[PDB]
Amino acid sequence: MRSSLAPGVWFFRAFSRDSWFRGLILLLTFLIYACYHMSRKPISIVKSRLHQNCSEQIKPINDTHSLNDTMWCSWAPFDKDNYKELLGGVDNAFLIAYAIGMFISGVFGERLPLRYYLSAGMLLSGLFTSLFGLGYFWNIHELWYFVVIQVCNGLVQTTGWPSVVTCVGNWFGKGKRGFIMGIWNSHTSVGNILGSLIAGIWVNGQWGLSFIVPGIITAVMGVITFLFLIEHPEDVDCAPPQHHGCEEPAAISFFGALRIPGVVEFSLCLLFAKLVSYTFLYWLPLYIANVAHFSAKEAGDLSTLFDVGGIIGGIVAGLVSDYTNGRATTCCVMLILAAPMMFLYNYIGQDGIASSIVMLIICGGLVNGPYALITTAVSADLGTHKSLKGNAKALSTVTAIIDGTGSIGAALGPLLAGLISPTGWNNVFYMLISADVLACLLLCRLVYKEILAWKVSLSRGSGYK
Amino acid sequence: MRSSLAPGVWFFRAFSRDSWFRGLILLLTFLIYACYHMSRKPISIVKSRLHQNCSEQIKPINDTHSLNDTMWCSWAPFDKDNYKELLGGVDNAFLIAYAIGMFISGVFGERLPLRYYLSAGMLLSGLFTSLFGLGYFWNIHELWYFVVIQVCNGLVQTTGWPSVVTCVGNWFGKGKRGFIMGIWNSHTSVGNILGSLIAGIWVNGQWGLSFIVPGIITAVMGVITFLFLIEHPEDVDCAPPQHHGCEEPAAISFFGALRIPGVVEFSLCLLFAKLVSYTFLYWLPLYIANVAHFSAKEAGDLSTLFDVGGIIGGIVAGLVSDYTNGRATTCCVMLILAAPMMFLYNYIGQDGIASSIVMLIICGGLVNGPYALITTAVSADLGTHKSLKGNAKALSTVTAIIDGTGSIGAALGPLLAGLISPTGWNNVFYMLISADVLACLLLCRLVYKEILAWKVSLSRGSGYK
Secondary structure, eight states, X not given: OOOOOOHHXXXXXXXXXXXXXXXHHHHHHHHHTXXXXXXXXXXXXXXXXXXXXXXXXXXXXXXXXXXXXTXXXXXXXXXXXXXXXXXXXXXXXXXXHHHHSTTHHHHTTTTSXXXXXXXXXXXXXXXXXXHHHHHHHTTOOOHHHHHHHHHHHHHHGGGSXXXXXXXXXXXXOSSSSHHHHHHHTTHHHHHHHHHHHHTTTSSSSOGXXXXXXXXXXXXXXXXXXXXXXXXXXXXXXXXXXXXXXXXXXXXXXXXXXXXXXXXXXXXXXXXXXXXHHHHXXXXXXXXXXXXXXXXXXXXXXXXXXXXXHHHHHHHHHHHHHHHXXXXXXXXXXXXXXXXXXXXXXXXXXXXXXXXXXXXXXXXXXXXXXXXXXXXXXXXXXXXXXXXXTTSOBOSTTHHHHHXXXXXXHHHHHHHHTTTSGGGOTTSHHHHHHHHHHHHHHTXXXXXXXXXXXXXXXXXXXXXXX | OOOOOOHHHHHTTSSOGGGTXXXXXXXXXXXXXXXXXXXXXXXXXXXXXXXXXXXXXXXXXXXXXXXXXXXXXXXXXXXXXXXXXXXXXXXXXXXXXXXXXXXXXXXXXXXXXXXXXXXXXXXXXXXXHHHHHHHHHTTOXXXXXXXXXXXXXXXXXXXXXXXXXXXXXXXXXXXXXXXXXXXXXXXXHHHHHHHHHHTTTSSSSOGXXXXXXXXXXXHHHHHHTTTSOOOSTTTTTSOOOSOOOOOXXXXXXXXXXXXXXXXXXXXXXXXHHHHHHHHHHHHHHHHIIIIIOOOSSTTTTHHHHHHHHHHHHHHHHHHHHHHHXXXXXXXXXXXXXXXXXXXXXXXXXXXXXXXXXXXXXXHHHHHHHHHHHHHHHHHHXXXXXXXXXXXXXXXXXXXXXXXXXXXXXXXXXXXXXXXXXXXXXXXXXXXXXXXXXXXXXXXXHHHHHHHHHHHHHHTTSSOOX
């Protein structure tokens, strides 16, 4: 008898129509690239079952031949003395192929529709992931099966990142990108944790089923993204974005994307800033079990907080980057301050667990912050750059160049972390601080431009345009 | 480069605006009354723990006094020889109060807003449910606590059914109500199964936590329904329903709702048709463990299929009722055919399990079908009846009369099933077939009207209006 509209459908009423289509994509691409990080994780959990030292795990009585020195419990290509080498090659053939084949998935992204391209990539990314664990049921014992599958999976997994940031760059304007994409980047941690939680169920058991369920969830999301993806904001005919400046512009040439004046320096900064976050997280279990002496459990517990620091730092850097209008001055002051604070972690970290939480969150903040900021905000900034003057379309080629040079660092991670490791386990810690000066020195020209632009903005005294 | 709108957002585009608001309510009220059936179930599972015969469950050594004849394991008001009586009174004080207090919740429903009334009912329905299990932690041992809480819970649980069918009767027109509400009525089985699955976790353990979690889920849904409920289709200003015939009409008087020419006969049919579905499902474990000799497990397994038969029969009756335009001729031919088929279950049911599945699904179809059809479709039909001529509003008073007389049958169920039970366990089976002739004879006038109306519709030979 008294209508008085309900507070929920009065709150949901206030949002405009083309402010719902922005909320859909920013959710949908949150689930698409959280399923790419789910299918990469099951080879770093089942690393510890394909060798399986038989000190524990007592023997069911079937064979008593030659005492079975780590060949009873093990999988047959990975059973002898060379298992760190043979399991190194399998994990290395993915990292080489994903970094070489990323540059091609940029120039295929702008020449194909992003719903027929991002949804064939997910089906093949589920298939080649699931064949790895399907090799358990077929009882396959050969190196060149598990190598070739990881090669094809590394070539297929690269259709994901040039398409997702293109979809979330066609919608959102220049207004807030450090805050919204900083909030948004928690999918690369949600995916790692939900991969570590799913693939670890069927390990210590039927390990070939650790690969099939994350391969099937990706192929189901690859058909949900075929049905509900709108790549341009003019397809539903609501509103073009806040990008200032019938037919569609022709895509850029690959040599033209290196001409945009900030790509090949942010690129070489990201190559050297991914290597820091690799070799610190490599050096850390060498520091726990040799100096600190905490446990064997805490080494996998502190690596989670080193990532939680990253999703705090990615939004703090984004807020400062938006409200101050400098994107390479934030990435320099966030990388300068990590070297004295990692020396401080080296000097304080011998103490209890109360000092190993207030340091690792800050370390993940200062190290995984510029990675997120460079890989999304300045990557969707330089794609829609003003020098293209509207008569070009280069948004998937720049975000392929920057991330495919950032993946050369992850590919050169374990090739150098295994080289100087026999000469002393405290010798990678100099590679850390060398790369944290290289990554800072590759931004000095950008920082000089950002400071020089403030003199013609602040000395004018609230001037004209 | 080729837009070609996605099949999902092209399918979701075709549905009109006021065909989404119909889909919301028909979902939202599906979850509101599935949470009323979740909080009724935990006293029929923890019936078997408050006595707990100590033949099994061996003794932890604390006391060796007087051999502890069913007082060691038990809860202290329900430990002596009279436990079927003391646990009968607790389960009977709910059934008396829910059936006496239903008639008042009709005349409070039309005089109050259905969002400030259906959302205080759910908060108090969570509170008085949760106090029952909170009496375990407070260590309460008195009969007149567990009795008075069930009295107040029976008076509070009755705000749910006159409001839900009023909300789904204000939106949907006369076009399809047997099919849509027949699909919709599966909440009274989903709620029973999800109550039986939640409350059975913490039984054989801390039983006072079997009542708190279904009490909290109801109080959370009672604040979701405060935020998202639209009770009139003119509140969002889309479209009034297909109900033929500023201010709102005044509600009807309680003596006026008995003047509508079909209420007090469908009412007395439902009183006698709920008692059949009670005493058959009471007689069935007396038939398993005395004649058929299947197991002690199957007696709780066949009672689920007797309900699955109901949600098949409720949509079959609804389709025949819509496409033939007779609502009391379906309810008579569905109640006539159950008596020879229950004699057939008595004569065939001695055989294996292959004959106890094709009979119990049909029995639940022929018995729980007219219950669903009468309790929703003819109950939302006679509320919007043509004799009110628009200048009245009687939709929650009729659906309170019909269901509050159908609950007198559930209240008189265990008062008569315990009376003639010591005179022979095959004596309730005559009460079955007596009530299945009473429930059929209380519809003969309606069936005569439905047949008589076909002569002035079919002999006209495609006549005028």
